[PDB]
Design a protein around this ligand. Structure first.
Ligand code: BSF
Length: 351
């Protein structure tokens, strides 16, 4: 890498790793549309396996950006509309509270207080139906945002129904394959296990366990190379050959709702650039203002998403107007503010 990129990355990340006691980390900086990679530490402490550019990390809720884009691609295909009632795709959802809750509300956490987590007791298609049927909204649709796996996770499951494909098959054929994300997985194949980092929670090696709507809400695993390619794709959707996918990326970066200084996309979240860095809790209910109609992807934005599982902490941020972006993948779930601080320190320096 150019020495400026080398220096700011190492001077920012080395101390982060020390302060947070992160066992292993991979970073990619996208600078004028070219990726530069950095790795530190261990993918597997016990077996002494280093982090490499081929190490798989759990992305946690960064997966929601993939779900949002897949949904966007389904809209572009004409298979679904965000204005469609949820019941159009799940007619068994007959309980009255569902009247007026649209796919947009699911995708953007504005359905009226769907909970952060699907309970562990929920397994089957039947258990899930019962869960959503029994759920009692706190609020009317489109009035408050409550970040939730059970909201965007259901969006992802319903969005692929017209396609006939499983969520995983749809993601592979419509997003991963076209973008050449050939080391990105919802389920890690046995051939790739050698590269699957362990996560670390309280010193114990852990991987994410199966749960309802996991693939849709928090279940993607990826390498630093594929994630840099994901960032490139989202920075410059017009270079993408598949028409509906190019459209879907654009739809995911549209601004649907505003709370404070932040705008909610499909998966992605955005603020106006330049952003006050300090401007960038188990449950956080916030009133939203509808953006009527949604603002198409704004190039002068800080576009980002944090992700976690029990054992992993991920962050992605990019600024389209500067052709600049960063991916930080770690096998410890360390505090969000520390991720954002480090990302801003690096991008601000390069911008
Ligand atoms: B996202 O913001 O990374 C989702 N957060 S989560 O708490 O649901 C991640 C998770 C999932 C399964 C088990 C533990 C933690």
């Amino acid at each position: 890498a150019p020495q400026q990129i080398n220096d700011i990355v190492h001077r920012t990340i080395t101390p982060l790793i020390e302060q947070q006691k992160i066992p292993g980390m991979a970073v990619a900086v996208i600078y004028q549309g070219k990726p530069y990679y950095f790795t530190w530490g261990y993918a597997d402490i016990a077996k002494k396996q280093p982090v490499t550019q081929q190490t798989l990390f759990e992305l946690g809720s960064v997966s929601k950006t993939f779900t949002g884009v897949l949904g966007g691609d389904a809209i572009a295909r004409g298979e679904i509309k965000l204005s469609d009632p949820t019941t159009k795709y799940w007619p068994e959802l007959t309980a009255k509270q569902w009247n007026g809750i649209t796919l947009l509300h699911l995708a953007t956490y504005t359905a009226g207080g769907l909970p952060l987590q699907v309970p562990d007791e929920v397994k089957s298609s039947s258990d899930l139906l019962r869960f959503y049927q029994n759920w009692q909204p706190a609020w009317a649709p489109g009035t408050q945002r409550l970040y939730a796996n059970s909201s965007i996770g259901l969006f992802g499951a319903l969005a692929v129904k017209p396609s006939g494909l499983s969520f995983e098959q749809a993601m592979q054929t419509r997003v991963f394959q076209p973008l050449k994300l050939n080391h990105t997985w919802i389920n890690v194949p046995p051939a790739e296990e050698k590269n699957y980092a362990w996560g670390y929670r309280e010193g114990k090696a852990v991987h994410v366990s199966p749960g309802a709507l996991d693939a849709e809400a928090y279940g993607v695993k990826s390498t630093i190379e594929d994630m840099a390619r994901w960032v490139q794709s989202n920075l410059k959707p017009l270079d993408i050959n598949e028409k509906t996918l190019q459209q879907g990326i654009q739809l995911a970066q549209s601004r649907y709702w505003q709370t404070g200084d932040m705008y909610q996309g499909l998966g992605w979240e955005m603020l106006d650039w330049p952003v006050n860095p300090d401007s960038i809790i188990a449950l956080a209910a916030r009133p939203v203002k509808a953006i009527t109609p949604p603002t198409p992807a704004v190039r002068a934005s800080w576009v980002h998403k944090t992700g976690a599982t029990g054992g992993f902490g991920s962050y992605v941020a990019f600024i389209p107007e500067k052709e600049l972006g960063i991916v930080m993948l770690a096998n410890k779930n360390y505090p969000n503010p520390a991720r954002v601080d480090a990302a801003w320190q690096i991008l601000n320096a390069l911008q």
